[PDB]
Amino acid sequence: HCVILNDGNFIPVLGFGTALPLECPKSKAKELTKIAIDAGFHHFDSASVYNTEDHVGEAIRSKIADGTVRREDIFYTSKVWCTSLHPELVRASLERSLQKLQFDYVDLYLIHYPMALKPGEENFPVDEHGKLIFDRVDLCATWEAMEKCKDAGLTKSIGVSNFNYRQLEMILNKPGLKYKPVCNQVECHPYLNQMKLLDFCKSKDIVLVAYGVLGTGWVDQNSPVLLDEPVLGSMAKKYNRTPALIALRYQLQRGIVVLNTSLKEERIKENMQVFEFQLSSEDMKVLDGLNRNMRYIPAAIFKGHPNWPFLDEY
Amino acid sequence: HCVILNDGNFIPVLGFGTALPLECPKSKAKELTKIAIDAGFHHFDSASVYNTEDHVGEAIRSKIADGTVRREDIFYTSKVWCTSLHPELVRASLERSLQKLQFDYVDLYLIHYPMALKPGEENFPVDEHGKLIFDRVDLCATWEAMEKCKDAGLTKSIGVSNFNYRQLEMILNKPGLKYKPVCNQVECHPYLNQMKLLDFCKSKDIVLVAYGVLGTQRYGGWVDQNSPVLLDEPVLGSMAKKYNRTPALIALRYQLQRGIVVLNTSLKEERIKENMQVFEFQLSSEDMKVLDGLNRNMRYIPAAIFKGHPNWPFLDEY
Ligand SMILES: NC(=O)C1=CN([C@@H]2O[C@H](COP(=O)(O)OP(=O)(O)OC[C@H]3O[C@@H](n4cnc5c(N)ncnc54)[C@H](OP(=O)(O)O)[C@@H]3O)[C@@H](O)[C@H]2O)C=CC1
Ligand SMILES: NC(=O)C1=CN([C@@H]2O[C@H](COP(=O)(O)OP(=O)(O)OC[C@H]3O[C@@H](n4cnc5c(N)ncnc54)[C@H](OP(=O)(O)O)[C@@H]3O)[C@@H](O)[C@H]2O)C=CC1
């Protein structure tokens, strides 16, 4: 099951992300990758900052050798980090990724955040007081750097992540614009259905790829989470499905491309089930009523940045 | 190595926390307890809300049965959750606990947080909008319930956890006070040395028990997790090389020489052992004030779900 980006390319509605817990060995990514592939996953979401590329790349390659899948049956997304938003550093970043993955190209390249930091190896440069050392950049300048990457054939498509209405407009209403972003990858779940941004994105032919659709110290990790919501728990029993699926399907029927991950092979398989059922129109209106502007990933570490995308209503 | 509490009792300066990562089956705790026991640990920090007591109590009893340790050689701590802060519930919890652990008594009982929630089985009662159902309670009335638990012999010592200046004052300056809290168990580490709260507690014969002394980088998603991490702190990493010790160890040593009781844990037996090494070295006076200069008000455990509560302890400077 796919959908089609405003650049004529197609993308799988269900994607397996590859960001790993701080603990887990980069190597773990590789194993989980394979698992997903054998589970039917063809869409892999990764980023240069995650530092799992080289592994996610190895895994994909491995399944290419034993012919379990063809390179053109795999949609691989990579993202450019904040420390490489300066035009001249955008392409060096994508090639570097490609080098680790040993791919000729990627199927999607995103600007990870509409914010920039001091260029350098350290993905998180900081001062003597421990504060992230920001940096200003002409994003429209960065977007051109991306368009060229698409023209250079390094990526079949390009887009953005964690961009807000204005920031998206800032690019759309760009003088000279050649390619519009095919998507805005943002957190979106029943407690943050991102409708206002979703409809803006729809009225521009841009696809909203969702992450944090299930919500990722003792008290906080044991505080009621998203998949605890009774509006789900019950509705889950209704369809004899698990709440996480109810959560998944909900994002799907909205025409939202949903990402997702797990370290448990038992759950990874379970997520393909999202195609085994539909939600009544009445239930969809019920989930639309759970929203409460609960942004689980605010990117706290950025707050004082000139471009924090989450200050605006959307 | 012990230290004495203002109630005449002694407490091990090094204890093991029995909290478990959301995943790990409640059972894991048992195994982990036994492990640490066989590594020299005698102080075990626990709490009702963790639901690891019956397991932690099974490990201690098992080790008592095979003559590896005697009961009186184990300093066990429990805390009363937010949902049982009403005077008429405090003792019910403590007994509930003793039942699962199968202990005649606990060595220390603390008020887990200065905030209360809707009495009930759910430790995190919420409304139809996902918000926690707060509830007001007269802390002093609770402390009176805490004192009676002492006299009833159910606990040897009593204290508070995650209290700030004012909240401690509000207990100390309590008319008719019988037993001052023996300690204030808070989060404390090189990036949050709690110094101002530390001195106040000392000037009041209240010991300070530090948890999260190494870096949980919790609360927040993957993004925030990457932010500058402690064990990577150069000032520590270097200093560690200077004594041929691990950074975490420099961190545990730093808290000890300040008269602080430290809690710590791990799921790696290799690390649980390595911890005893905190007693094999000393940090020079100079190195001590170097680590003092690391502070940066970095609270990793804010108890975010409580922000809106009337008694959220982390708004005041301390
Ligand atoms: N562009 C951006 O800004 C961001 C992109 N992402 C992308 O999204 C991917 C995943 O998103 P993430 O933020 O982790 O959040 P998710 O919404 O995927 O939820 C995270 C948690 O879901 C749990 N889970 C998975 N399957 C099930 C199930 N069937 N039932 C119950 N719980 C389940 C997992 O637990 P367990 O591991 O124990 O199974 C995991 O910790 C990343 O790897 C990345 O590619 C993420 C954040 C930001
Ligand atoms: N009353 C309250 O409100 C609270 C009480 N607590 C108490 O404090 C206890 C411990 O505190 P906690 O917040 O967990 O924080 P800790 O500082 O104990 O962090 C625990 C982590 O330390 C890691 N670790 C242990 N030794 C080393 C080492 N030598 N080098 C590197 N990493 C190491 C472990 O990782 P790994 O497992 O990978 O080895 C483990 O996950 C709890 O179990 C609980 O009893 C905690 C929070 C709140």
XYZ file of C-alpha atoms and ligand atoms in Angstrom:
728
model
C 0.000 0.000 0.000
C 1.385 3.335 -1.139
C 0.378 6.935 -1.732
C 1.874 9.444 -4.142
C 4.027 12.485 -3.366
C 3.516 15.737 -5.279
C 6.587 14.918 -7.334
C 5.072 11.877 -8.961
C 6.864 9.406 -6.698
C 5.121 6.915 -4.455
C 5.637 6.211 -0.765
C 4.559 3.343 1.544
C 1.900 4.417 4.100
C 3.598 2.411 6.835
C 7.216 3.127 7.746
C 9.659 1.608 10.221
C 11.850 4.225 11.882
C 15.446 3.469 12.807
C 16.310 5.720 15.761
C 17.701 3.659 18.641
C 17.646 4.226 22.391
C 20.770 5.936 23.669
C 21.806 2.594 25.215
C 21.280 -0.004 22.455
C 24.350 -0.698 20.264
C 24.228 0.918 16.842
C 24.414 -2.685 15.636
C 20.962 -3.407 17.058
C 19.500 -1.279 14.274
C 20.670 -3.810 11.674
C 18.873 -6.721 13.333
C 15.631 -4.792 13.771
C 15.884 -3.685 10.172
C 15.997 -7.222 8.845
C 13.131 -8.275 11.124
C 10.915 -5.532 9.700
C 11.850 -6.465 6.106
C 10.875 -10.051 6.768
C 7.689 -8.625 8.238
C 6.835 -6.835 5.013
C 8.279 -3.377 5.777
C 9.560 -1.535 2.699
C 9.683 2.009 4.139
C 12.639 2.824 6.380
C 12.967 6.199 8.109
C 16.468 7.117 9.348
C 18.604 10.235 9.850
C 22.273 11.123 9.816
C 22.073 12.146 13.447
C 20.714 8.744 14.551
C 24.014 7.194 13.451
C 22.333 3.915 12.520
C 22.525 4.443 8.782
C 25.592 2.256 8.134
C 23.732 -0.518 9.955
C 20.304 0.064 8.452
C 22.212 0.118 5.191
C 24.003 -3.149 5.833
C 20.748 -4.898 6.682
C 18.952 -3.687 3.537
C 21.949 -4.776 1.458
C 21.942 -8.209 3.094
C 18.308 -8.798 2.042
C 19.254 -7.581 -1.452
C 21.898 -10.309 -1.727
C 19.706 -13.237 -0.664
C 17.167 -11.639 -2.991
C 14.516 -11.193 -0.304
C 13.875 -7.690 -1.717
C 14.961 -5.411 -4.586
C 16.546 -1.981 -4.084
C 13.599 -0.429 -5.911
C 11.139 -2.024 -3.492
C 12.702 -0.164 -0.579
C 11.876 3.430 0.298
C 14.750 4.835 2.329
C 14.475 8.278 3.957
C 17.453 10.170 5.293
C 17.576 13.623 6.912
C 20.080 16.449 7.040
C 20.990 17.635 10.547
C 20.997 21.155 11.978
C 24.787 21.417 11.851
C 24.675 21.031 8.092
C 21.990 23.448 6.927
C 24.451 25.757 5.214
C 23.936 25.099 1.478
C 27.501 23.970 0.910
C 27.200 21.381 3.716
C 23.863 19.900 2.695
C 25.247 17.796 -0.136
C 28.364 16.683 1.719
C 25.920 15.373 4.341
C 23.774 13.389 1.925
C 26.785 11.831 0.230
C 28.251 10.911 3.593
C 24.990 9.125 4.419
C 25.027 7.375 1.056
C 28.631 6.369 1.771
C 27.605 4.658 5.040
C 24.551 3.062 3.408
C 26.391 2.175 0.207
C 23.363 3.300 -1.782
C 23.532 5.361 -4.973
C 20.595 7.405 -3.821
C 17.883 7.649 -1.161
C 14.143 7.809 -1.782
C 13.552 10.850 0.440
C 15.752 13.496 2.014
C 14.357 15.787 4.774
C 15.609 18.895 6.607
C 15.418 17.455 10.118
C 14.559 20.701 11.925
C 14.028 24.233 10.742
C 16.918 25.154 13.064
C 20.662 25.362 12.624
C 23.610 24.876 14.977
C 27.362 25.473 14.779
C 28.805 23.381 11.909
C 31.191 20.722 13.125
C 31.374 17.015 13.916
C 29.541 17.287 17.247
C 25.835 17.017 16.401
C 25.157 18.933 19.608
C 27.748 21.699 20.030
C 27.517 23.441 23.400
C 29.197 26.250 25.330
C 30.838 26.380 28.772
C 27.431 26.645 30.419
C 26.125 23.635 28.496
C 23.848 25.613 26.167
C 23.446 24.575 22.521
C 25.394 26.962 20.293
C 22.787 28.022 17.741
C 23.367 29.409 14.275
C 21.339 31.331 11.714
C 20.781 30.100 8.169
C 18.773 31.113 5.122
C 16.560 28.049 4.946
C 15.371 29.040 1.484
C 19.088 28.836 0.709
C 19.184 25.401 2.276
C 16.167 24.335 0.246
C 17.936 25.148 -2.959
C 20.801 22.981 -1.777
C 18.209 20.184 -1.500
C 16.571 20.746 -4.916
C 20.006 20.329 -6.466
C 20.382 17.041 -4.562
C 17.214 15.831 -6.205
C 18.429 17.067 -9.613
C 21.840 15.543 -8.990
C 19.921 12.304 -8.515
C 21.087 11.822 -4.918
C 17.509 11.600 -3.712
C 14.294 10.801 -5.539
C 12.337 13.227 -3.328
C 12.773 15.970 -0.717
C 10.743 17.394 2.165
C 10.784 18.735 5.723
C 10.313 17.673 9.327
C 9.152 19.691 12.356
C 8.292 22.718 10.214
C 5.325 24.933 11.119
C 2.717 26.590 8.895
C 4.787 29.776 8.480
C 8.062 27.900 7.962
C 6.381 25.785 5.263
C 4.922 28.908 3.652
C 8.347 30.510 3.854
C 9.500 27.867 1.349
C 6.358 27.533 -0.717
C 6.178 31.282 -1.341
C 9.818 31.103 -2.393
C 10.954 33.130 -5.386
C 12.473 30.722 -7.906
C 11.024 27.649 -6.177
C 11.561 24.520 -8.269
C 10.332 21.711 -6.044
C 7.772 21.895 -3.255
C 8.342 19.746 -0.209
C 6.537 16.412 -0.629
C 5.986 16.187 3.105
C 6.303 17.509 6.642
C 7.281 14.800 9.129
C 5.865 15.860 12.443
C 4.648 14.307 15.705
C 0.996 13.442 15.423
C -1.214 11.211 17.496
C -4.699 11.196 19.024
C -3.558 13.729 21.670
C -2.054 15.926 18.952
C -3.944 15.126 15.737
C -2.216 18.060 14.043
C -5.440 18.787 12.114
C -4.806 22.529 11.574
C -1.397 21.682 10.090
C -2.771 18.593 8.383
C -5.372 20.532 6.435
C -2.851 23.228 5.569
C -0.549 20.520 4.252
C -3.382 18.940 2.269
C -4.283 22.271 0.658
C -0.728 22.360 -0.712
C -0.285 18.787 -1.929
C 2.206 18.006 0.858
C 1.987 14.692 2.788
C 2.094 14.659 6.594
C 4.320 11.724 7.638
C 3.496 11.004 11.297
C 5.804 9.924 14.123
C 5.270 9.616 17.851
C 1.875 8.224 16.874
C 1.967 5.992 19.985
C 4.045 8.239 22.272
C 7.607 7.198 23.202
C 13.023 8.953 35.871
C 10.605 6.415 37.355
C 7.575 8.724 37.850
C 7.496 10.049 34.296
C 8.085 6.695 32.599
C 5.288 5.310 34.793
C 2.901 8.230 34.240
C -0.171 7.443 32.163
C 0.942 7.336 28.529
C -1.028 7.512 25.274
C -1.831 3.824 24.829
C -3.495 3.988 28.250
C -6.305 6.199 27.031
C -9.641 4.487 27.818
C -11.238 5.945 24.694
C -8.779 3.677 22.875
C -8.579 0.708 25.228
C -12.297 0.157 24.857
C -12.583 0.978 21.157
C -9.760 -1.519 20.845
C -11.922 -4.236 22.376
C -14.737 -3.250 20.057
C -12.665 -4.238 17.011
C -10.848 -7.017 18.905
C -7.632 -5.154 18.148
C -4.887 -3.664 20.312
C -5.050 0.087 21.100
C -1.780 0.760 19.264
C -3.456 -0.504 16.068
C -6.535 1.586 16.744
C -4.016 4.418 17.006
C -2.346 3.356 13.762
C -5.451 2.858 11.654
C -6.720 6.248 12.846
C -3.652 7.998 11.448
C -3.953 5.972 8.217
C -7.548 6.708 7.282
C -6.608 10.364 7.567
C -4.251 9.923 4.629
C -1.283 10.264 6.975
C 1.899 8.253 6.315
C 2.669 6.646 9.682
C 6.154 5.763 10.917
C 6.632 3.320 13.774
C 9.187 1.143 15.590
C 9.756 -1.513 18.212
C 12.571 -3.620 19.636
C 10.135 -6.509 20.087
C 9.800 -8.768 17.050
C 6.389 -9.788 18.432
C 5.117 -6.209 18.145
C 6.851 -5.429 14.847
C 4.830 -8.106 13.106
C 1.634 -7.055 14.888
C 1.832 -3.562 13.329
C 1.238 -4.828 9.770
C -2.235 -5.671 11.041
C -3.237 -2.032 10.469
C -4.391 -3.185 7.036
C -6.754 -5.813 8.437
C -9.447 -3.351 9.434
C -11.241 -0.062 9.048
C -12.676 2.357 11.603
C -16.307 3.412 11.359
C -16.837 7.052 10.396
C -18.394 7.565 13.853
C -15.403 6.164 15.699
C -13.049 8.401 13.701
C -14.990 11.431 14.976
C -14.525 10.044 18.487
C -10.719 9.881 18.201
C -10.746 13.359 16.657
C -12.139 14.321 20.028
C -9.144 13.126 22.037
C -6.811 15.885 20.862
C -5.423 17.998 23.694
C -2.295 19.614 22.237
C -0.048 17.179 24.084
C 3.289 17.526 22.254
C 5.406 14.629 23.575
C 8.560 15.674 21.698
C 9.048 19.461 22.076
C 12.794 19.397 21.373
C 13.327 21.110 24.731
C 17.061 21.373 24.107
C 16.204 23.980 21.423
C 13.604 26.218 23.164
C 15.644 29.408 23.082
C 16.327 29.119 19.369
C 15.140 31.939 17.043
C 13.299 29.318 15.036
C 11.740 26.998 17.590
C 8.845 25.638 15.496
C 6.539 24.873 18.402
C 5.800 28.331 19.725
C 3.129 28.959 17.063
C -0.328 27.431 17.283
C 0.839 25.336 14.331
C 30.320 2.451 56.097
C 27.440 4.129 57.911
C 26.442 7.592 59.057
C 24.031 8.482 61.829
C 20.561 9.991 61.540
C 19.292 12.674 63.942
C 17.021 9.999 65.463
C 19.982 8.049 66.830
C 19.920 5.490 64.020
C 22.580 4.707 61.415
C 22.162 4.417 57.638
C 24.522 2.980 54.954
C 25.999 5.834 52.899
C 25.578 3.613 49.851
C 22.208 2.136 48.940
C 20.571 0.319 46.070
C 17.401 1.609 44.486
C 14.808 -0.938 43.530
C 13.069 1.016 40.814
C 12.768 -0.794 37.462
C 12.571 0.390 33.834
C 8.993 0.353 32.545
C 9.737 -2.858 30.655
C 11.506 -5.239 33.068
C 9.131 -7.715 34.745
C 8.553 -7.002 38.455
C 10.519 -10.182 39.078
C 13.804 -8.814 37.753
C 14.017 -6.793 40.954
C 14.424 -9.993 42.972
C 17.429 -11.120 40.948
C 18.947 -7.610 41.066
C 18.512 -7.404 44.825
C 20.278 -10.731 45.416
C 23.089 -9.670 43.095
C 23.787 -6.437 44.994
C 23.522 -8.232 48.327
C 26.378 -10.486 47.235
C 28.325 -7.355 46.285
C 28.319 -5.704 49.675
C 25.038 -3.739 49.573
C 23.046 -3.515 52.816
C 20.918 -0.451 52.072
C 17.996 -0.974 49.751
C 15.801 1.897 48.713
C 12.271 0.982 47.624
C 8.798 2.495 47.414
C 5.252 1.191 47.311
C 4.536 2.779 43.985
C 7.338 0.708 42.384
C 5.498 -2.587 43.101
C 8.890 -4.267 43.501
C 8.616 -4.789 47.256
C 7.214 -8.344 47.358
C 10.119 -9.195 45.061
C 12.754 -7.160 46.905
C 11.523 -8.646 50.130
C 11.809 -12.147 48.686
C 15.468 -11.606 47.788
C 16.406 -10.276 51.229
C 14.541 -13.123 52.970
C 16.151 -15.640 50.644
C 19.569 -14.264 51.543
C 18.644 -14.314 55.214
C 17.602 -17.959 54.938
C 20.951 -19.096 53.558
C 22.810 -17.071 56.159
C 24.324 -14.540 53.766
C 23.030 -11.618 55.848
C 20.993 -11.057 59.006
C 17.837 -8.917 58.965
C 19.404 -6.259 61.207
C 22.199 -6.007 58.636
C 19.809 -4.690 56.016
C 18.636 -1.056 55.952
C 15.374 -1.188 53.981
C 13.533 1.994 52.933
C 9.957 2.495 51.767
C 7.961 5.590 50.792
C 4.260 6.460 50.995
C 2.723 7.277 47.601
C 0.695 10.402 46.810
C -2.594 8.545 46.945
C -2.180 7.612 50.626
C -1.103 10.932 52.190
C -4.297 11.361 54.138
C -3.562 10.712 57.848
C -5.962 7.748 57.853
C -4.153 6.021 54.969
C -0.481 6.476 55.782
C -0.335 3.526 58.155
C -2.465 1.380 55.865
C 0.188 1.698 53.132
C 3.093 0.971 55.460
C 1.373 -2.204 56.631
C 0.362 -3.114 53.080
C 4.079 -2.926 52.307
C 5.266 -4.910 55.337
C 2.825 -7.597 54.172
C 4.314 -7.998 50.693
C 7.865 -7.822 52.070
C 6.928 -9.916 55.060
C 8.933 -7.663 57.375
C 8.019 -6.891 60.959
C 9.313 -3.381 60.303
C 11.076 -1.083 57.789
C 14.241 0.831 58.661
C 13.121 4.076 56.984
C 9.750 5.427 55.789
C 9.536 8.564 53.627
C 6.808 10.774 52.147
C 7.523 10.150 48.499
C 6.358 13.584 47.238
C 4.800 16.575 48.943
C 1.799 16.186 46.618
C -1.377 14.143 46.991
C -3.756 12.438 44.564
C -7.291 10.966 44.576
C -7.194 8.038 47.036
C -7.598 4.745 45.198
C -5.821 1.706 43.768
C -4.597 3.555 40.664
C -1.304 5.274 41.411
C -1.975 7.773 38.656
C -5.711 8.615 38.705
C -6.633 10.802 35.748
C -9.639 12.608 34.318
C -11.252 12.145 30.891
C -8.655 14.597 29.546
C -5.683 12.612 30.840
C -4.846 15.052 33.628
C -3.868 13.681 37.037
C -6.606 14.091 39.634
C -4.849 16.190 42.265
C -6.047 16.385 45.857
C -5.108 18.564 48.814
C -3.819 17.253 52.143
C -2.378 18.813 55.278
C 1.178 17.610 55.138
C 1.648 18.181 58.890
C -1.355 15.923 59.479
C 0.473 13.330 57.330
C 3.715 13.834 59.239
C 1.791 13.151 62.431
C 0.709 9.914 60.794
C 4.397 9.336 59.976
C 5.409 9.870 63.609
C 2.839 7.470 64.961
C 4.194 4.872 62.551
C 7.548 5.368 64.230
C 6.203 4.910 67.770
C 4.090 1.929 66.707
C 7.467 0.405 65.872
C 6.551 -0.198 62.210
C 9.510 1.953 61.098
C 12.800 2.786 62.850
C 13.200 6.148 61.135
C 11.090 8.584 59.098
C 11.845 11.242 56.495
C 10.625 13.032 53.377
C 11.462 12.801 49.676
C 11.483 15.649 47.140
C 10.662 18.395 49.590
C 11.983 21.886 49.055
C 13.056 24.539 51.561
C 9.589 25.882 52.429
C 8.104 22.380 52.536
C 10.771 21.274 54.979
C 10.345 24.430 57.042
C 6.614 23.754 57.115
C 7.352 20.418 58.804
C 10.111 21.561 61.126
C 8.258 24.632 62.398
C 5.280 22.406 63.138
C 3.718 23.107 66.550
C 3.947 19.920 68.663
C 6.636 18.349 66.461
C 7.968 15.068 67.900
C 10.321 13.675 65.275
C 12.175 15.819 62.708
C 12.518 14.167 59.299
C 15.820 12.250 59.252
C 16.418 13.157 55.617
C 15.264 14.660 52.310
C 15.704 12.278 49.390
C 16.152 14.355 46.296
C 17.782 14.286 42.890
C 21.364 15.506 43.122
C 24.454 15.366 40.910
C 27.374 17.378 39.519
C 24.894 19.228 37.255
C 22.518 19.843 40.140
C 24.570 19.736 43.320
C 21.587 20.829 45.373
C 24.095 22.833 47.437
C 21.637 25.386 48.846
C 19.220 22.678 49.919
C 22.172 20.662 51.236
C 23.365 23.342 53.642
C 19.882 24.077 54.876
C 19.372 20.396 55.635
C 22.680 20.222 57.471
C 21.900 23.276 59.576
C 18.772 21.290 60.502
C 20.316 17.887 61.254
C 18.528 16.526 58.185
C 20.555 14.263 55.940
C 20.298 14.548 52.184
C 19.871 11.362 50.156
C 20.747 11.770 46.525
C 19.169 9.750 43.715
C 19.710 10.104 39.961
C 23.338 10.895 40.777
C 24.588 9.904 37.350
C 22.289 10.853 34.483
C 18.912 9.493 33.465
C 18.648 12.080 30.684
C 15.004 11.283 31.171
C 11.899 13.209 30.261
C 11.899 14.178 26.631
C 12.372 12.200 23.459
C 15.361 10.937 21.527
C 16.365 14.522 20.705
C 16.762 15.747 24.228
C 18.459 12.491 25.216
C 21.505 13.431 23.147
C 22.033 16.769 24.895
C 25.323 16.933 26.856
C 25.445 13.826 29.033
C 27.203 13.653 32.421
C 29.412 10.589 32.233
C 30.819 12.271 29.108
C 31.524 15.464 31.002
C 35.194 16.110 30.353
C 35.783 17.567 33.814
C 34.721 14.128 35.042
C 36.214 11.951 32.340
C 39.573 13.619 32.775
C 39.509 13.659 36.563
C 38.593 9.973 36.323
C 41.787 9.285 34.383
C 43.634 11.231 37.094
C 42.728 8.593 39.676
C 42.389 5.745 37.182
C 38.670 5.382 37.951
C 35.430 5.531 35.977
C 33.631 8.891 35.684
C 30.507 7.535 37.379
C 32.786 6.626 40.267
C 34.109 10.175 40.420
C 30.436 11.161 40.612
C 29.628 8.784 43.461
C 32.783 9.841 45.327
C 31.878 13.502 44.899
C 28.508 13.065 46.578
C 29.962 10.979 49.458
C 32.604 13.410 50.650
C 29.865 16.037 50.920
C 28.083 14.104 53.648
C 25.457 12.833 51.229
C 23.889 9.340 51.279
C 23.838 8.123 47.676
C 21.516 5.723 45.920
C 22.420 3.953 42.713
C 21.356 1.062 40.515
C 22.022 -0.899 37.397
C 20.900 -3.940 35.463
C 24.521 -4.861 34.817
C 26.028 -7.117 37.488
C 29.394 -5.969 36.184
C 28.460 -2.415 37.190
C 26.770 -3.250 40.503
C 30.042 -4.706 41.698
C 32.242 -1.883 40.386
C 30.226 0.438 42.654
C 31.795 -0.637 45.939
C 35.014 0.929 44.622
C 33.678 4.296 45.734
C 35.366 3.472 49.039
C 38.840 2.849 47.553
C 39.794 6.469 46.914
C 39.404 10.084 47.914
C 39.018 13.274 45.920
C 41.415 16.093 46.740
C 40.100 19.329 48.235
C 40.902 21.050 44.959
C 39.186 18.412 42.828
C 36.151 18.721 45.064
C 35.605 22.426 44.362
C 36.234 21.730 40.681
C 33.187 19.441 40.606
C 31.363 22.116 42.615
C 31.822 24.378 39.622
C 29.879 22.056 37.334
C 26.457 22.934 38.692
C 24.023 24.279 36.116
C 20.553 23.672 37.565
C 19.961 20.604 35.409
C 16.952 18.758 36.807
C 16.568 15.459 34.960
C 13.651 14.202 37.102
C 11.052 17.031 37.184
C 8.045 14.770 37.740
C 6.571 16.522 34.711
C 3.103 15.026 35.204
C 2.772 17.143 38.340
C 3.698 20.605 36.991
C 0.179 21.914 37.561
C -0.112 20.636 41.114
C -0.462 23.078 44.042
C 2.595 21.633 45.776
C 4.955 20.972 42.877
C 8.323 21.196 44.664
C 10.418 22.277 41.704
C 9.290 25.867 41.166
C 11.107 27.468 44.118
C 14.830 28.162 43.827
C 15.172 25.343 46.345
N 11.468 13.580 12.338
C 11.394 13.621 13.687
O 11.459 14.674 14.320
C 11.219 12.333 14.430
C 11.132 11.094 13.766
N 10.964 9.927 14.489
C 10.886 8.674 13.698
O 9.864 7.877 14.229
C 10.358 6.567 14.595
C 9.578 6.006 15.765
O 8.887 7.023 16.527
P 8.926 7.183 18.125
O 9.137 8.622 18.445
O 9.893 6.235 18.730
O 7.476 6.860 18.693
P 6.275 5.821 18.430
O 5.035 6.625 18.279
O 6.673 4.867 17.370
O 6.157 5.060 19.847
C 7.348 4.655 20.557
C 7.098 3.394 21.388
O 6.037 2.567 20.835
C 6.164 1.276 21.438
N 5.393 0.283 20.621
C 5.691 -0.157 19.330
N 4.834 -1.043 18.854
C 3.933 -1.201 19.857
C 2.750 -2.023 19.978
N 2.359 -2.829 18.978
N 2.030 -1.953 21.166
C 2.436 -1.123 22.193
N 3.545 -0.299 22.180
C 4.253 -0.389 20.974
C 7.661 1.042 21.484
O 8.053 0.289 22.609
P 9.097 -0.919 22.455
O 10.352 -0.372 21.809
O 9.213 -1.390 23.888
O 8.415 -1.933 21.585
C 8.281 2.446 21.459
O 9.096 2.755 22.571
C 11.845 6.817 14.815
O 12.660 5.660 14.821
C 12.158 7.861 13.745
O 12.503 7.227 12.533
C 10.878 9.958 15.922
C 10.965 11.171 16.608
C 11.135 12.364 15.866
N 11.721 8.819 45.815
C 11.812 9.267 44.550
O 11.089 10.167 44.120
C 12.834 8.637 43.649
C 13.677 7.601 44.108
N 14.623 7.024 43.260
C 15.449 5.916 43.865
O 16.790 6.016 43.423
C 17.214 4.750 42.833
C 18.282 4.980 41.809
O 18.084 6.229 41.143
P 17.935 6.422 39.568
O 17.078 7.628 39.286
O 17.524 5.156 38.924
O 19.367 6.804 39.033
P 20.820 6.135 38.957
O 21.819 7.245 39.013
O 20.903 5.015 39.914
O 20.814 5.592 37.442
C 20.584 4.194 37.179
C 21.451 3.772 35.998
O 22.865 3.883 36.310
C 23.583 3.124 35.346
N 24.921 2.859 35.931
C 25.198 2.239 37.150
N 26.489 2.135 37.421
C 27.093 2.705 36.344
C 28.479 2.915 36.008
N 29.461 2.515 36.833
N 28.763 3.545 34.800
C 27.752 3.954 33.951
N 26.403 3.803 34.175
C 26.142 3.167 35.397
C 22.710 1.903 35.104
O 22.741 1.483 33.748
P 22.667 -0.078 33.336
O 21.405 -0.645 33.949
O 22.712 -0.013 31.823
O 23.905 -0.708 33.901
C 21.288 2.329 35.552
O 20.282 2.255 34.558
C 15.892 4.136 42.348
O 15.948 2.763 42.008
C 14.946 4.515 43.483
O 15.002 3.533 44.505
C 14.761 7.474 41.902
C 13.935 8.505 41.417
C 12.966 9.094 42.277
